Structures are given as C-alpha cells and as structure tokens.
C-alpha cells in the first residue's frame, strides 16, 4: 500500500569454502557496488564490533 | 581544523536521572477488569474503512 | 489491608509550566556508567 | 549580547529520582493529553514496606470504565546511562 | 575459540605476543587496552563438527504436535514420555541416530550403541 | 599408531634476520599455511581421481 | 580513539595492500597523525601555559 515499486536487497557471501577469508557484502539500491556489511551497521549508527 | 561549525544553541537542563523502569499493567483482581480485554479486542475487530 | 507499605501521592505536572518546553529522553550508548556531574 | 543567557548545559537538578513508565494505550491516552495535568492527585503510589512489589491505585475519577488498581511492573531495577534533558529557546536581545 | 571484546569501546581483541615475558596478550587495534589471555588457544577448524545437532530445544519442546512420541526410557528420571527427532544438521554425512527429550526432566539422550 | 590420539605439532622457524613487521601476520601466516597444507597437499594418488570402487 | 578520515580509509580499503596491518593504529599513534580533540587541545593548552 502507498507506492507499490519493489526493491530487492541481497546478502551474498563471497569466496568458497576452501578460501582464507569470505567476507559477506550486501547490494543497495542506487549504490552500483556491494558494500561489507559492517560499513552498513556503522552507516545505521552501530559503530562497536 | 574548521573554523565555522554552524551551531543551533538551545536552553537545556538535565533533570531527573532515570532510576526504574516500570511497566503498568492493569490488575486482573480488579472488578473494572475485563473491560480492558473487550477494548483490546474491539481494537482487531473495527472496521474504520467505510 | 494492614498498613505494612508506604503510598505516596501522585499528582499531575501544572500545565503552566509544560508550555514552551520539551523534556526529551538522553540514552548514552556505552558499556561503562557515564555520569554528567562527575565524569 | 546575541544571547542574554547563559548558554551551559545545566547540571543542577541531575540528582533527582525519575521512573520511566510504559502505559497501556486506554491509560496513556488520557494522561498524555496536554488539555489536562492541572496539577490534581492522579491517584497513589503504594510500595510495600520490604520492597519487591509495587501498585498503582488511581482515583474514582476513572468514572468506572477502566480498572482503579495497577502494578507497576519493574522490568529495570537499576537503570543506567539514561536521563531526561528539557529543551526551550533562549532570550535573544542583549 | 571464547571470542573476546575490548572493556572500553567494547571493539574486538587480538592476540599479540610480548618477549619480554614470553606470554600471550590480547589488545585492542584502536583504544590500546590488554589483557592476559587465560587459554592458549587462538584458533579452531572444526572440519567434521558436531555444533547443532541438537539446535532447537527449548522449554516447550513437547508442546510441537508434529515431533514423534517414543516410549524409551529416560536414564537420569525414569520416565517413558519423550519427543525424539533425527540430527539437525543439513550435512549429507551425518548418521541417522536419534535424540530424545524427555517430557519430565529436559534430559536430552541418544540412541547411539556405536560410540554414545 | 598405538597413542588413543592420532596428532601433528608443527612449527615455522625463523631466518636469522629478524621481522618486526611479521608478528602482527604472524598466526595470520599460521592460518594461510593451514589452510594451503589442507588443501594441495597431494598424500598420494592421481589428481581429478575423485573416488575408487572396486567391483568383482 | 583517534578515528581515520574518508580520504585516508578509502586508500586502506583499496588495494594499497593485502591487508591493513593489524597494529595500524598504533603505528600512526606515534607518527603524530590522526590525533583526537582531547589531545589535540590539551598540547595546545600547555603550549600556553608554557609561556
Ligand atoms: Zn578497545
Ligand atoms: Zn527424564
């Protein structure tokens, strides 16, 4: 109700499991690039690990 | 560093310190009882859209 | 009941003074106890 | 001279006891109402001589469609790092 | 591992290691706050794990309709009552053995006859 | 064979010269050889032979 | 704890290198860069009343 567009946000975790670091990147809309989830808590005002 | 930081002073006092945090719940031994549960229920049955 | 409790009066605030004045809700976010009058 | 008041947060009246209270809805509705609070008894506050129990007992004033007797329930006996801060404008000539 | 977190900014700590005593320290990459570790252990890789198979337990276990009901006995209580179910992890290795929680006590036991 | 504990204690030994910078790596150079010595360490066999069966 | 600026995180986070290193903050600590307010105005403060 209200505007009835869609926005889709995807979670993805990079690498495999044979791999030495998989890191976990999500996509927002209007960004053009997947940022590390811990930037986006710290955009939300969550800064302690 | 900045030389204009562009402020909003405001007039502010800190007064009280928050010591409880308390929840009032209605006591189910009170004869006016009951009245609540129907109001709580009268809330999921309206239908305000004509 | 017996009167083994203390009740005290609760009261409205006068509204004489609500006017022209917000009282807001301070949370500091910390792990510590932070105090504005001694720390 | 732009402000003829002093411009410090004032730490004077930080060391005052303050309960912060959720209400239910029917009770929030009328004691929140700014057409109201002209300083009358709202009812009591009645805490028991060893503590651990709390109650809430309005006056007859309800007008018997709403419950004369609450508990107040203590979800935090100790609260820190929260406080209550006023805000109002300041005096702007000289 | 026992994950530890910084007292002051409550960031993550990170073992450094300090000659001048020959011991383990874990600090902290902002605030430089230490603290002796109490364990020698830093790391684990547990390539064949056994962390879940009994995930999902809770106080009203026996009030699921849907778990089976077992008639084995509970060896801490001596009751026959109990709701059973299969391991929870989603590995394709993992044996077909049960669990069984009892409906009296919340003791948790296994079927297994192999290595218990 | 006969220990109830089947296990491998390994150890890198330093050059000579001394690093100062290595230590923040150094249990980071612990996991990256760790992982590596799990993975193309070739025990014995052929490679790509993923699984052997044998049939009568 | 004497944060980064967005110039300088951006360039970490880049392929500068592998990885930032683990004590990078307490390397730059003693450079002198990337102080905090508190720091920065107390030298300030006692280069007053130095004099
Ligand atoms: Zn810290
Ligand atoms: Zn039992």
Known sequence: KGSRFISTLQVKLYGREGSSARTIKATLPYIKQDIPIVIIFRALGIIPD | ?50 | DPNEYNEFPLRAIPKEDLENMRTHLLKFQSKKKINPVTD | ?94 | ?116 | ?56 | ?51
């Open chain 6, 1 to 56: 064979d006969n220990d109830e504990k089947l296990i491998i204690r390994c150890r890198v030994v330093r050059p000579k010269s001394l690093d100062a910078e290595t230590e923040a790596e150094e249990d980071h150079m612990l996991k990256k050889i760790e992982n590596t010595m799990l993975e193309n360490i070739t025990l014995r066999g052929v490679e790509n032979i993923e699984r052997v069966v044998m049939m009568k």
């Open chain 7, 1 to 51: 704890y004497a944060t980064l600026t967005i110039d300088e995180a951006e360039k970490r986070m880049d392929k500068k290198s592998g990885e930032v290193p683990r004590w990078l903050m307490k390397h730059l600590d003693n450079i002198g860069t990337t102080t905090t307010r508190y720091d920065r105005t107390r030298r300030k403060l006692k280069a007053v009343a130095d004099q």
């Open chain 5, 1 to 116: 591992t026992t994950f530890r977190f910084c007292r002051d900014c409550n960031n993550m700590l990170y073992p450094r290691e300090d000659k001048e005593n020959n011991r383990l320290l874990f600090e902290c990459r902002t605030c430089s706050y230490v603290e002796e570790a109490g364990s020698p252990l830093v790391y684990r890789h547990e390539l064949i794990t056994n962390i879940g198979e009994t995930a999902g337990v809770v106080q009203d276990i026996g009030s699921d309709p849907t778990l089976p009901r077992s008639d084995r006995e509970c060896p801490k209580c001596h009751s026959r009552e109990n709701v059973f179910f299969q391991s929870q992890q989603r590995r394709k290795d993992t044996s077909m053995v049960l669990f069984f929680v009892c409906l009296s006590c919340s003791h948790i036991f296994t079927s297994d006859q192999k290595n218990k």
């Open chain 2, 1 to 50: 560093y900045i030389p204009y930081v562009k402020t909003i002073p405001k007039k502010t006092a800190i007064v009280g310190t928050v010591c409880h945090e308390c929840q009032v719940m209605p006591s189910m031994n009170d004869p006016n009882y009951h009245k609540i549960v129907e109001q709580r229920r009268n809330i999921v049955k309206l239908n305000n859209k004509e």
């Open chain 4, 1 to 94: 001279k732009v402000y003829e008041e002093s411009l410090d947060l004032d730490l004077e009246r930080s060391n005052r006891q303050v309960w912060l209270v959720r209400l239910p809805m029917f009770l929030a509705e009328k004691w929140r109402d700014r057409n109201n609070l002209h300083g009358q008894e709202l009812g009591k506050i009645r805490i028991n001589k060893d503590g651990s129990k709390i109650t809430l007992l309005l006056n007859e004033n309800d007008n018997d469609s709403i419950p004369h007797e609450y508990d107040l329930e203590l979800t935090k006996k100790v609260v820190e790092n929260e406080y209550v801060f006023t805000e109002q404008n300041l005096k702007k000539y000289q």
